[PDB]
């Protein structure tokens, strides 16, 4: 179901996957509000965008792309949660409306 939260699966994650990397990946194509990175079906992340349109733009532009040449291939689907909540801003979760510390 279309939604403003995307679920990213990072195939062949040869390099670190942190919120700063995913912000530089996603935000130029769709405005990001929150990012949560976790391990489940491999290295995965949910990214909450400002709107459904912004999430659709990010999904269209990034699905199947590699973050870095030859690795870190993105598989993107709509996430189940309609919103994300970030406990703290660190390397694995970030709310871009709120300060570090």
């Amino acid at each position: 179901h279309m939604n403003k939260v995307l679920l990213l699966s990072i195939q062949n994650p040869l390099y670190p996957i942190t919120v700063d990397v995913l912000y530089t990946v996603c935000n130029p194509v769709g405005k990001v509000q929150r990012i949560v990175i976790f391990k489940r079906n491999g290295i995965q992340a949910m990214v909450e965008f400002e709107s459904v349109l912004c999430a659709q733009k990010a999904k269209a532009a990034l699905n199947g792309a590699d973050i870095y040449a030859g690795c870190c291939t993105l598989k993107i689907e709509y996430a189940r949660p309609t919103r994300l909540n970030v406990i703290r801003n660190d390397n694995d979760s970030w709310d871009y409306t709120k300060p570090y510390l």
């Binding site: 670190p16 990397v21 990946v25 532009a61 990034l62 699905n63 199947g64 792309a65 870095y68």
Partner: peptide, 12 residues
């Protein structure tokens, strides 16, 4: 797969 071969960032 229209983004096959797309690369987003310089390698670290």
């Amino acid at each position: 797969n229209p983004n096959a071969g797309k690369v987003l960032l310089p390698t670290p």
